[PDB]
Write a protein that binds this ligand. Structure first.
Ligand SMILES: Nc1ncnc2c1ncn2[C@@H]1O[C@H](COP(=O)(O)O)[C@@H](O)[C@H]1O
Ligand SMILES: O=C(O)/C=C/C(=O)O
Ligand SMILES: [Ca+2]
Ligand SMILES: [Ca+2]
Length: 631
């Protein structure tokens, strides 16, 4: 039935969901026009009192019976941190940083951080706002070349890193003279691998003659608890226009986020990106977050639950190896997926089908969908949203058949904020739009059946610029002040839009046909044999190739050579037949990769998107050699 009825039924039978309903009085107080961002956050966190705010998987420390090594092992439960405790921890960090005897920090300085998403990272983010720092969250998969370049541009006074990334942090700090302090977070007292990582970091710094101080965030909080709270708001140079955050995207360019635009994450217009946050019903917001804080989508969900009195459960591991465990324990009411997560779930379903030898829409097949919905994903899902990348209709249909709720598609960017939701512009923040012909790619407003062109918009959430890069900023605005999305869209009904592709992903083959490479990647990603695919073309050639990571099942059946190429070929031609793709849209030959694209190896971005230039760097020589061999 309707969302209103399903919400009412859930809160009538589920005490945890009932208690997570927003309190309108808290939001009204926190969002008043007179309050600065730091005061807004404080009003939300203090307003929700002792409610659970954040949850992380519990762990135990065991001694290995052979070596005596003290090892952490996850336990089958989450432990929560209340709104009160989160605010107290963030104030403790702010107090310690501001009053440090040798390397205090002051408003307007920069802090750069490398981590995933966690209670500690959230506390450090908030503390940065309380102090008036500018935060620079760095990609965990970036090379040290990239880290050093961003650190040179931003000259941070403080560097923060999770234990996992501490070696890269040390390398960056050593080459960045502005760094005075290195804070280590997600540090687990008593765990040998964490203690050894911090000792090694201290030793490397000492060997280099560095004056950088190393402290765990555990220690920073313990010292800060006994210190007076810093006064809010911080004494920055520009009020609501002070620089609060830089979101590096793409040297990568840093999108500037003033306080007023960070405030939109905290009960502002971002609650309309993937849902109807404006009008009833008010859905209790219990959510699992698997997105790094370095990506805007990580911020949307996390600050969304914090600003609505709900709860964010953090996935236990960045590589997603605990995904189903965590969703089954957390049992969220609201889902946010991106396509690579939807593909993973589809692959899980296909992998069950094959293990038990059941077919398409059999009773057994439907029982796997039911178990996914009710057990693995928790059975409490009321709403679901997706975004950050295109998804094929077939994958959308699968996900909706599993969840038995509509999957909202939200389109937006770091630069513009949320732009549309289920084809319709999000207004506010969007105030004006137009389509721009792209003749060199064959996209015109006179196209049939639908006008097509690059989307340009005026919007309240537009970035003021890229940090220290006014020439790059000028390139993304036209002469009338519209922001150029770089994205080709079709207007399929009045003020309703569908994504075609990024301009950068559109390729003109040698016989003059145009291909939207990410549309093809989304289509072929649904092959039961494909784990990942990157479609590759050349202006000098008349046909496409692809890098394909087969599923473990495909590799076990066909190997990694000619046999699996032939099976993949059949599967892709099948998809081309069903979805009406042209013959020139079908990859003719393949580079087979048994090593998945990952965030760790840098081929996926923090958001899980396949980075075309990283694929090109790793496989481009082999792809071009295959073109030459075949010619
Ligand atoms: N719902 C969506 N459908 C298709 N592509 C999307 C969607 N949302 C975001 N994108 C893509 O992601 C880009 C923004 O990425 P980011 O700046 O990481 O949010 C856009 O310019 C599009 O290429
Ligand atoms: O869905 C949004 O509004 C943002 C998307 C992105 O930057 O990927
Ligand atoms: Ca700790
Ligand atoms: Ca311009």
């Amino acid at each position: 039935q309707s969302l209103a009825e399903r919400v009412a039924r859930l809160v009538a039978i589920d005490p945890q969901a009932a208690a997570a309903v927003p309190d309108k009085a808290v939001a009204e107080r926190a969002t008043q026009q007179g309050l600065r961002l730091a005061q807004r956050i404080e009003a939300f966190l203090s307003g929700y009192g002792d409610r659970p705010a954040l949850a992380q998987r519990a762990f135990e420390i065991t001694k290995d019976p052979i070596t005596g090594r003290a090892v952490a092992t996850l336990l089958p439960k989450f432990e929560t941190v209340s709104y009160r405790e989160l605010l107290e921890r963030s104030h403790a960090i702010a107090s310690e940083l501001a009053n440090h005897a040798e390397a205090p920090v002051k408003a307007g300085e920069f802090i750069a951080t490398i981590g995933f998403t966690s209670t500690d990272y959230t506390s450090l983010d908030i503390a940065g706002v309380l102090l008036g720092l500018t935060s620079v969250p760095l990609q965990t998969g970036a090379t040290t070349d990239t880290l050093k370049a961003i650190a040179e541009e931003t000259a941070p006074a403080v560097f923060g890193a999770s234990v996992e990334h501490l070696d890269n942090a040390v390398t960056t700090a050593l080459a960045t003279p502005s760094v005075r302090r290195l804070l280590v977070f997600d540090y687990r007292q008593g765990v040998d691998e964490d203690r050894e990582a911090v000792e090694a970091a201290r030793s490397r710094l000492a060997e280099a003659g560095s004056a950088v101080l190393v402290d765990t965030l555990d220690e920073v909080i313990a010292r800060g608890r006994a210190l007076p709270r810093v006064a809010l708001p911080p004494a920055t140079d520009a009020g609501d226009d002070s620089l609060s955050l830089l979101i590096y995207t793409s040297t990568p360019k840093g999108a500037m986020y003033p306080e007023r635009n960070v405030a939109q994450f905290w009960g502002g217009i971002w609650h309309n990106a993937f849902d109807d946050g404006d009008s009833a019903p008010d859905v209790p917001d219990i959510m699992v977050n698997f997105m790094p804080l370095s990506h805007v989508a990580g911020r949307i969900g996390l600050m969304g639950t914090l600003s609505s009195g709900g709860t964010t459960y953090f996935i236990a591991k960045s590589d997603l190896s605990t995904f189903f465990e965590d969703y089954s324990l957390a049992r969220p009411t609201k889902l946010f997926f991106v396509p690579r997560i939807c593909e993973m779930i589809y692959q899980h379903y296909q992998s069950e089908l094959d293990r038990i030898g059941a077919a398409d829409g059999s009773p057994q097949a439907e029982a796997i969908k039911t178990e996914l919905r009710e057990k693995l994903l928790g059975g409490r899902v009321l709403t679901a949203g997706s975004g950050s990348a295109p998804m094929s209709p077939e994958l959308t249909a699968f996900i909706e058949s599993v969840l038995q709720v509509h999957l909202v598609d939200g389109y937006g960017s770091t630069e513009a904020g949320p732009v549309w939701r289920d084809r319709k512009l999000v207004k506010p923040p969007v105030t004006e739009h137009k389509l721009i012909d792209v003749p060199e790619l064959g996209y015109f407003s006179t196209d049939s059946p639908y006008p097509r062109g690059e989307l340009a918009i005026k919007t309240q959430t537009i970035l003021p610029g890229y940090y220290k890069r006014p020439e790059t900023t000028a390139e993304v605005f036209d002469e009338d002040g519209f922001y150029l999305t770089g994205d080709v869209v079709a207007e399929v009904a009045p003020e309703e839009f569908v994504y075609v592709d990024r301009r950068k992903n559109v390729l003109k083959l040698s016989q003059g046909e145009f291909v939207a490479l990410s549309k093809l990647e989304a289509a072929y990603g649904t092959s039961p044999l494909v784990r990942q695919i990157s479609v590759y073309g050349s202006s000098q050639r008349s046909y496409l190739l692809a890098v394909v990571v087969p599923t473990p099942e495909a590799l076990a059946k066909y190997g990694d050579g000619e046999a699996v190429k032939s099976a993949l070929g059949d599967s892709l031609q099948k998809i081309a037949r069903e979805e009406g793709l042209q013959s020139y849209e079908v990859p003719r030959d393949f580079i087979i990769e048994t090593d998945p694209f990952t965030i760790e190896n840098g081929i996926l971005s923090d958001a899980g998107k396949t980075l075309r230039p990283k694929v090109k760097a790793r496989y481009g020589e082999r792809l071009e050699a295959l073109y030459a061999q075949l010619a």
